[PDB]
Amino acid sequence: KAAELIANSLATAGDGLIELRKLEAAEDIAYQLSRSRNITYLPAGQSVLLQLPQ
């Protein structure tokens, strides 16, 4: 049914509408195939204490 509705919308929507529907679906697939992330990360500094002289 989703097909049916999309097709109807697409038809009214014209060719351009199917085209980009294809693109974002492709977006989804591409994401699916490669779903990963990362973070640059900037490490924090560890600390220690020294006794400063007078």
């Binding site: 049914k1 097909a3 049916e4």
Partner: protein
């Protein structure tokens, strides 16, 4: 003592084997029927199958 434990285990294994076999047949028949049902359901014109 040991023998009894062993015997019970043996029965346990066989029974489970039977259960397993039953389950498999049931699934196969289930999918079977599901197939037929889906095919019938396709009565909603070919947009349905698509």
């Amino acid at each position: 003592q040991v023998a009894q434990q062993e015997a019970q285990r043996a029965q346990f294994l066989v029974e489970k084997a039977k259960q397993e076999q039953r389950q498999k047949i049931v699934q196969a028949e289930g999918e079977a029927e599901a197939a037929k049902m889906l095919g019938e359901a396709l009565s909603k014109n070919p947009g349905y199958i698509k």
